[model samples]
Target: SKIDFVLSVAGGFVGLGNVWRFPYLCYKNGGGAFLIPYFIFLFGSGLPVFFLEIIIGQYTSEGGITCWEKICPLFSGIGYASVVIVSLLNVYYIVILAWATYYLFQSFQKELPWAHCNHSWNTPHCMEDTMRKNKSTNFTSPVIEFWERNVLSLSPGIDHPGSLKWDLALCLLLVWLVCFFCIWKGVRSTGKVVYFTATFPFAMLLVLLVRGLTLPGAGAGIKFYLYPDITRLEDPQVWIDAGTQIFFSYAICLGAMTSLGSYNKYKYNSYRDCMLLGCLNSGTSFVSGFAIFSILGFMAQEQGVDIADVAESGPGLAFIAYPKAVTMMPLPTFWSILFFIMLLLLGLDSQFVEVEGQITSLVDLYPSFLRKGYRREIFIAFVCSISYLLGLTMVTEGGMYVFQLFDYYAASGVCLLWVAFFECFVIAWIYGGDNLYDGIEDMIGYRPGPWMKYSWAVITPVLCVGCFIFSLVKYVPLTYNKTYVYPNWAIGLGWSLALSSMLCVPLVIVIRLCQTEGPFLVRVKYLLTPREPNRWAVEREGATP
Candidate 1:
C-alpha cells in the first residue's frame, strides 16, 4: 500500500505535462532560465502545497469535496471547485487519449501512414520530404496535413461543431472504458494498475532518450532547448509560466492528489514520499526534453530550418512534430508505435487518477448510494457513460477547436491559479498552518520544521497571487494556430468556463454566511472556523485549534 500510494501519486504527477507541455514551455520560454523560478516555486509553493494536500487527505481520510469541508467549512466549495475543474479536465483530457489511441493504432501500419503524402487526405500543399535534400520549397509537412485532414478533419471554427467523427467517437469510448475498468473497484484495482501504469512509460522514455541521443542533430536540439537567455527572467510571465508548470506538473489543485492521498494507510510517511515523487516528476520532465527536442532538432535539420521552426507545444508537438520526425528515423513504424503507445500509457495513467478522483468524491459524499456489488458497478458505469457523452463534443469535426477552447479556458493557468490561491488561503490562513502541521505529526510521528509553516502561511499565497495577477495582465485572446480568431461569443463562452471553478469560492462564502447563526461579523468569523469532527486530534498533538 505504501508503494502503491507512492506510485499512484507519482503516476498522477508524472504525466503529459512532462512530455507534451514542459518541453515546449522550456524552449518557448527562456529555456534554462525557466528552471530558476521553477525550482524556487517547486520547493516554496509546489512541494509545500503538495505535502499539505496529502496530509489533509491522509489525516481526514476524506475525498476531495469533503476534505475541505472538514478542514474549513466556509471554503468547502474549494473541494467542489476542485472536482469541477477535474471533471472538466476528465472530459477533454480523454479526447487527448483518444487522439493517442488513434495514433497508436495508426502506428501499427507497415509504412507509417503519416510518413508520405499519398493518402486521399493529402492536399496539393503537402510535401512528402522527410529529409532536407529538397530544401527550397515551403510546402506543408505531410504529417501536418495528415493531422489536419486525416486525424482531425478539423472544421473552420467552434460556431459549427459539425458531425461527430465516428472513428474518434469509438476511440473516445475505448478510452473511457479503459478508465472505467481501471478504477471501477476503486483502490483495489487502481493500486494494482499503478504497478504497471506508473512505471512503464519511463521505460519508453529511456528508450526514446537513447535513440534521440544517437540522432545527428540531438546536441543542437539540446543546446537550443537548454541555452539560457538570462534577460528573459525579467519578464514576469516567465515566473508565472514556471509556477503554473509546477502546479500542472505536480498535479496540485486538481483533487486527484487529495483523493489519492486519502487512500493512503494512516501511518504512511507522506513527507518523504512527497519529496521523492516531486523530484521524480521534475527529473522526468527535464530528461524528456532531451528526447523530445533532440528529435525535434533532427526534424529541423531534415527540413533545413532552425530548431525553432520544428518545436511546438500541445497537440502539435506530440501529434504533428514528433510524427514528422519519426518518419525520418529508421524503422519508423517501430518507433512510431513505441512513441504513441508511450503517449497512451502516459495519458491513461493520468486519466485513471482523474476519474478516480471524481468517483472517490461521489462515494465519500454518498456512502449509502452504492455500498456494494452491481450497484457500485452501475455508479461507475453511469459516471463513464455520462463523461463519454459529454466528451462527444470534442470528437466532432470541429472538435479540435472545442479542445482548444477547453485547454485554453478550463485547463489554463488563470483558472488553476484562482483555485490554488484560495485553497492555500483557506488552509494556511483560515484553518491555520500550525493546526495542519500538528495533524500531519499525528499520523507520521515526527514534527516538520518551521519552513513548511512559513511556506503555507506566506510564500505559497504570495506566489499564487503574484502569478495570478501577471497571468491576467498578460492575457492574450485565445486563438488556434495563430490564425483563426475566436469570435466574441466563443470568447465569452471561454470566460464562463474559466469562471466555473473560480466562482465557487465567494459563492460558497455567501451561502455559508447566510446559513450561519450569528451577528454578521460573528457569522463571518464562525464561517472561517475549522470544522473537523475530531478536534481532539489537534488537542492530542498539543496544538491549539
Candidate 2:
C-alpha cells in the first residue's frame, strides 16, 4: 500500500523554489556552503514536519483547519492561521505566475524581445541596447517600454515613472486571465495541468546544465557555489538563515502537505513516500546547484567576468544574470525560449500545490457548498478572482519591488518561521508527540528512532523558535536598492498582511477556549455536536450521511 509517487512528489515539489528562488539562492550562497545547511535542516526539520502533517491529515481525513480542530480543540486557532496564510500568500504567488506567463509568451517571439533597447518601445533597456539618455532609474523609460512590449504588463513601472501606462494595464489584465484560467477549472484541471508544469522544468534544467558544464568557465561557477567556508556555520545568522531557508525551500508547515495527505486513501502507506520525497527534494536542490551554477559560470566566461562579480541577489540573479546568460548562447533566442519555458513550468509546479492546499481545505470543510451536484469551480473561481484583484498591486509602479518586500519579509520571514515554530510546539508537545511517533511507525511498519523523537520534541522546536527570533532581529527594513528607507506605510501594510495570515489560527483557539467556559460555549457545542449518541455519528451526519 505504498502511496502513489506522483501525487506525493507533486505535493512535495510544488513548493517555493522551482524557479528564480532556487537558482538565486544557489548563486548567492556560493554552491557548496549552501548545501550543507540545506541538507542538515531538510533531514532534521523538514522530514519530521512532513511526516507530522501527513499523520494529522490521514488520521482525520480532513482539511488542515478542521484537522486541528479535531485533534486539540484548544489549539484550533492554528488551523485558522493556516487558511489565512495560504490565502494571503496565494495572492502574490499568482502574481509570480503572471510573470512566468508574460515571459513564456515572450519566449515564442521571433527574436529575443528583451535583448536590445527598442526606443520605439518605452524601455530603452530591452534586448541589451543602451539608451543614449543617461541611465535614468525613473519609472518612465524602462518601465513604459517594458509594459508596452511585454504581454503581461499590468501597470507602469515604479522604478521609472510614466514609462508605459497601457503596458501596465494590459499586464494586469493578462495576469488576471492566466491565474483565473489555470485555477478556475478546479482540481481536475490542476491535476491535468501539472502533467505539463511539473515535468517540463526538469528537462529544461538538464539542457541548461549540460550546456553550462561544457562551457569554459562553468567550473568556476560550480566552485563558487560548492566551495563552502565551514566558518559560515559558526555565525548565528547563518544558522538562523539556514533554518529559515529549510522552511521556505522545503515548504514545511504550510498545511498543503496535510491537505494532500487527506486526499489519499486511509490504508495507503504515505510515510514511505514522505521519506522518498524528502530525499528527492534535497537531491533536486543539491543537483540544481550544479545546473544553475554551470549556466552562470558560462555567463561569466562570456562576459569576461568572474563568478563573484556576476553573483547577485535572487531577483538580480534570475531577471538580470540568467537572462544575460541566455544572450551569451550561440542561438541566444532559442536558448532563451527553452530557459523561460522551463522557468514557467517550474513556477506552475509550485503554484499548483499552493492552490491545491487552499482548495483542499475549503472544500473539505464545506462540502455542502457543492451539494447541488456542481463541482467546486464556482468557489475556486470566486477565490482566485479575488486573489487576482488583490494581486494587481504587484503591477503598480515598484509593485514588483513591493511584492518582493512583502514576500521576503512577511511571507517567508515572519509568517513561515512563526508557523513552523507554532506547529512543532503544538504537535510535538501539546498534541502528544509520542502518539504521532506511534502513528508513523504503524504506517511505515517501523517506529522512528530515538534521534527522530529528540529532534521532533526538543531540537526542532528550539531550532525553529530560536532561528525565528534571530531572523526577526536581523530583519532590517524593506529596502529596494539595498539601502533602508523605511516606507512606514509599506511596513505597516506588510505587517498587516502578515498578521492577517497569522491572526486567525490563535483566534480560533481563543474562541474554542472561551466557548468551552463561556455562555457561547454551550450554544456552539449544541450546534456542532450531533443529536446522535456518539461523536462518530455526529460527524457522519455532518458529512451528510
Q: Write the per-residue lDDT of candidate 2 for residues 251-364, one digit (tens) a residue.
A: 666777777777765546677777777677766766766766776676556445566554454343565545655655688878777776566555555666677667767776
lDDT for model 1 comes to 0.77
Candidate 1, clashing residue pairs? none
Worst 10 residues of 2 by lDDT: 532-541
Model 1 lDDT per residue over 229-271, tens place:
7897767767766787888888788887777677776767788
Best by TM-score: 1
Task: Please give each candidate's TM-score.
Answer: 0.90, 0.80
lDDT of candidate 2 at residue 200, scale 0 to 100: 62
**Prediction 2 TM-score vs. true:** 0.80
